[PDB]
Amino acid sequence: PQRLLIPTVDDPG
Amino acid sequence: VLRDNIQGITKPAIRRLARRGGVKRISGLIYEETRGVLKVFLENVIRDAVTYTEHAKRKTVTAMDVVYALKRQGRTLYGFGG
Amino acid sequence: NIQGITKPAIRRLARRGGVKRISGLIYEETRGVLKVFLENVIRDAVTYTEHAKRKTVTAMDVVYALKRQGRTLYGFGG
Amino acid sequence: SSRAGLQFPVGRVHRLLRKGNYSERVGAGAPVYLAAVLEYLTAEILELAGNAARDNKKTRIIPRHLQLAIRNDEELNKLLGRVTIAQGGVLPNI
Amino acid sequence: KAKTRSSRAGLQFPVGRVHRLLRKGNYSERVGAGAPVYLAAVLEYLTAEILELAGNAARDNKKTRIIPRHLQLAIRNDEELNKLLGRVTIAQGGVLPNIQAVLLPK
Amino acid sequence: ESYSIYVYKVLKQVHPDTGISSKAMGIMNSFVNDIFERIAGEASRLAHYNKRSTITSREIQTAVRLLLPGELAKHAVSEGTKAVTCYTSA
Amino acid sequence: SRKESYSIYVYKVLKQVHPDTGISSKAMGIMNSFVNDIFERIAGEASRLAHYNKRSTITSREIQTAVRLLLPGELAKHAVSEGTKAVTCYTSAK
Amino acid sequence: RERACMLCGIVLPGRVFMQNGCPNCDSVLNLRDSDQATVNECTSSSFEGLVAVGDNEHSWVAKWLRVDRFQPGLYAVRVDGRLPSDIVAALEQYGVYYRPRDGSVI
Amino acid sequence: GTVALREIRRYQKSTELLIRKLPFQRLVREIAQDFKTDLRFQSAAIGALQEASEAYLVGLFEDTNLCAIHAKRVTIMPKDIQLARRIRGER
Amino acid sequence: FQRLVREIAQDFKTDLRFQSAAIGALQEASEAYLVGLFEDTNLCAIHAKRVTIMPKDIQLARRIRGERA
Amino acid sequence: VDEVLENGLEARLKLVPRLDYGFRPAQRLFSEAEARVHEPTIRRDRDGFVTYGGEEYYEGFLYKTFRLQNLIVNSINPTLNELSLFQSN
DNA sequence: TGTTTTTTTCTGTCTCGTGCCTGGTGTCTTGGGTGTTTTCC
DNA sequence: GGAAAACACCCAAGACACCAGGCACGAGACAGAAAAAAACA
Ligand SMILES: [Zn+2]
């Protein structure tokens, strides 16, 4: 998918 | 062993082949000359075919070799692979 | 200028082949067959040259075309 | 094949050109062009063979029909002068 | 001293040149080592035969110059060489003298 | 490998109600292979002559004019050109 | 740029077989064309025959078989013998 | 001279694609075992947005560009040109779905 | 003379092979024996040889018929055979 | 011969220069072809118990050679 | 834009010729007769396809390749005169 | 006087050394295709 | 000679592993090619 790959808080800065 | 087998190509067979070519009358000396020509042609094709088999370390002559060999003599054959 | 292939010249060409007598009607036939052969070889050389992006036909194109027609020529850089 | 509007496999021609030891590299337009030429030629000969089969009141094409179609066409028999068709027979000429 | 492959095999023809032409003449990815030696030997023998017969044919003509005429004579007067070089035309080679028997007067 | 399916497709394109024997299928396969070999070999020979290492549409086109005779080749060249733009455009 | 040729080697073998005979420039051109044509014939036959057995190498066997396929008669046998002689001579040295 | 592979998104020199193939797309395009045809159609020299990835597994950028299963190196955000229909059908035969990176499809 | 044209009409419309299979098979084996012994042969190779030899002989007879027609005759002779072969280039 | 070659070449695309060596090679090939054709036609004439060659022998020689369909 | 080259850097285009036939002349359809009168060295390759002075003219219209950096593909303002001159053929 | 052998400058292509991938070779098993033989028609 | 049957067995096809052999990179150089000088017919 593409929509699920949105950035979260725990993703690297 | 096989000895003097070219005479197995019968005289009516040569007659039928000439009839296919549109020949109306046939001389009596045509048959031996035709047998000689057929022997020469067969020897020429078989030499190249057996050389192709010998290089591949095979003991059986396949159809592909015979096609390749006639094509190498400018007598390309359709219907038997290639 | 197909008439430029004159009657003594074609007579000489027949004479090299060992021909003793010449019919009067044969000359137009020889001119025709020579025209046909020249037409074929010239056509093949011209398209070889056009593929080579050149404007001048060289001897190599001619020898190539002839060798492709089974008429291999020795002596011109083949 | 669908991009080029062709039925012949362009990839197959490309693979044969690559593994056929003709040149080091093959352009993208060469297999497409070759496949198109093969399709047009096979369509032409099959069209003439179907016409000959229809004239012979047959529903299945026989090598006799292929031999007739090839030999009755000046351009095709000029192309295929040195070809002998197996089970084709000869052209009727008296 | 880096000795030439031609000197190693006892040949006059260049083994290196035929090796380069085989490798560069788009036949097969890799070329075996013995193939240029074998091909050069075959080319040598054949050119030796042709030049021998041509020198002999010049020698019957009391000439010290080999011309295309002598080459054409050497090729066409030998049965197997004529068989091999059947479909080739020698430039400025001419034709062998041949007059038919019944062509002659009585 | 064989060209059976593609020959069947073009046959049903030009003649939906006509069948074909297996011997004719072998003949068609031999014909397609022979024509392919001729065109590809002549194109390679042209590439060798012009000191080129790439086979493009050009050498294939000139090989087609060199081998196929008359009007045939012209229509074939036209067809090939149309295929190229069809490959391009699309 | 220069253009390679077989002129010197042809002159060398002529001086080997006929010490008192020279050769004209036109005959040199014919000999060069002859050597080149024979080279193309043998190389193409070897390349095809190798492609038949799904092999990637031209070895002495492929050249030998190509020589037997092209050369007509005793010439082939003589050529084959000398070629084998050259190979073992090369194999006997290093 | 550098080109951007349309399928995986990696950027490498065109001669590197010709000699060695694409290290990731070789399993479905056979680029290492293919001619300049497939190199030209599946890799484009016109691109934008050079991307260098060090750790594919944990980089959110790699997940966003769908390159987290590929070899680290130079990558392009946008690649001009799309894969042809026959190559798309061949990939669908293998069961792999092709999502264009040209930006026109979203 | 009538049945000659009947035979021409019958055989020019037919497609089956006119050379008998077993003598030709024995001929091929006899010729191949003196190049190499214990040679095996695929059936398709023998059939290909038969078809090619028949096609070649039919073509030779057609050219020979043209040569016979040239000399204001209707009967083909051996001199026509070697004339056609000589002009066609065989030795 | 040079004028004839230029006339034939004019029909496809003009402004085509023809090297002297190309014209010489064409002349040699044409002479070789004509000499071979006359040898075959002489054999045809001798076969028909004549010593004069006629156009029918030329056509027959071309027919058996395969040059004429 | 008659033809778009696959490389994308150039493209063969259909143009109105600008020649004086022997500071630029005004655009006008290629006149074969005037070109022959002022320069009889015209070459011919097909029917309707004329090569004059090394430039290929098809039925009075020039066909010449031009680079991508020599073209405007946006904000194009067309005129009735040029539209009629291009679509008359 | 011109075709051609021999001398000389110059250059570019062959040889040699090391490494490294992989195509070719060997072996073993298995199915299947062709040779041999009988007999009736 | 063809059709049909029934064995015999010989041999072509295919998979696993191992290593001898040819390409690849690079430096040195000495043998081939052109300019040219002279010889011979
Ligand atoms: Zn990729």
Report the CATH number that the domain containing residue H47 is assigned in CATH: 3.30.40.210
What dihedral angle (degrees, nearest 10) is formed by the CA atoms of B25, B30, B35, B39?
Answer: -110
Q: Give one DSSP letter per residue of F12-75, joined into a string.
A: HHH-TT-EE-HHHHHHHHHHHHHHHHHHHHHHHHHHHHTT--EE-HHHHHHHHHHHS-THHHHH
Residue I54 · residue I47 · CB < 8 Å: no
Closest CA to D26 of K82, H33, C23, H37: H37
Which residue in the set J3, J30, J45 is minimally distant from C37, CB to CB?
J30
Distance between CA H5 and CA H54 in Å, rounded? 19
How crowded is residue E85: how many other Cβ atoms within 10 Å of its Cβ?
Answer: 20
Which CATH entry fits the domain spanning E4-106: 1.10.1060.10, 3.30.300.130, 1.10.20.10, 3.40.50.300? Answer: 1.10.20.10
Contact I38 B59 (CB under 8 A): yes
Query: Is I72 within 7 A of strand M by CB distance?
Result: no
Residue of chain G minimizing CA distance to D19? G51
Helices (runs of H) and strands (runs of E) counted in chain E: 5, 2
Ligand 1: distance of its center to the CA of H12 in Å? 9
Domain range C1-78, CATH architecture: Orthogonal Bundle (1.10)
Q: Where are the domains of chain E?
A: 4-106
Range of the domain at G40: 3-93
Helices (runs of H) and strands (runs of E) counted in chain I: 4, 2
Distance between CA K74 and CA K78 in Å, rounded? 12
Closest CA to J27 of C73, E67, C14: C73
Best F49, F60, F68 residue to mutate vs chain C (most C CBs within 10 Å): F49
- For B3-82, CATH gives 1.10.20.10
Closest CA to C41 of C52, C33, C51, C53: C33
Class of residue B18 by CB neighbours under 10 A (exposed 0-12, middle 13-18, buried 19+): buried
Terminal C-alpha separation, chain I: 34
Here the tokens at position C61 are: 């194109």
Asked if J52 has any chain K CB less than 8 Å from its own CB, the reply is: no
Here the tokens at position H77 are: 């955000």
Distance between CA B54 and CA B50 in Å, rounded? 6
Closest CA to D94 of K3, I10, E35, K35: I10
Reduced to 3 states, what is the DSSP secondary structure of residue C72?
strand
Resolution in A: 3.6
Min Cα separation I29/chain J (Å): 32
Distance between CA G32 and CA D73 in Å, rounded? 43
Measure B22 CA to M23 C1' (Å).
Answer: 61
Distance between CA F59 and CA H52 in Å, rounded? 41
Residues of B in contact with I10 (CB under 8 A): 19
Count of structural domains within chain H: 1
Q: Which method, experimentally, gave rise to this model? A: cryo-EM
How crowded is residue F71: how many other Cβ atoms within 10 Å of its Cβ?
Answer: 9
Residue E21 · residue G39 · CB < 8 Å: yes
Here the tokens at position H59 are: 């980089």
Within 8 A by CB and 6+ apart from J14, the residues are: K43, K44
Cα-flanking dihedrals φ and ψ of residue I76, to 5°?
Answer: -80, 145
H8 is in an annotated binding site: yes
Closest CA to H9 of H82, H76, H63: H76
Residue F40 · residue D23 · CB < 8 Å: no
Measure H38 CA to M37 C1' (Å).
Answer: 59
Here the tokens at position K53 are: 């002075």
Count of structural domains within chain F: 1
> CATH class for domain D1-94?
mainly alpha
The two beta strands, K49-52 and K43-44, are antiparallel
How crowded is residue J24: how many other Cβ atoms within 10 Å of its Cβ?
Answer: 18
Distance between CA F65 and CA F80 in Å, rounded? 12
| Neighbours, chain J (3 or more CB pairs < 8 A) | C, D, E, I, K
H42 is in an annotated binding site: no
- Among left, alpha and beta (phi > 0; psi -120 to 50; other), residue A12 is beta
How crowded is residue K1: how many other Cβ atoms within 10 Å of its Cβ?
Answer: 10
Residues of G in contact with D20 (CB under 8 A): 51
Distance between CA H57 and CA H51 in Å, rounded? 15
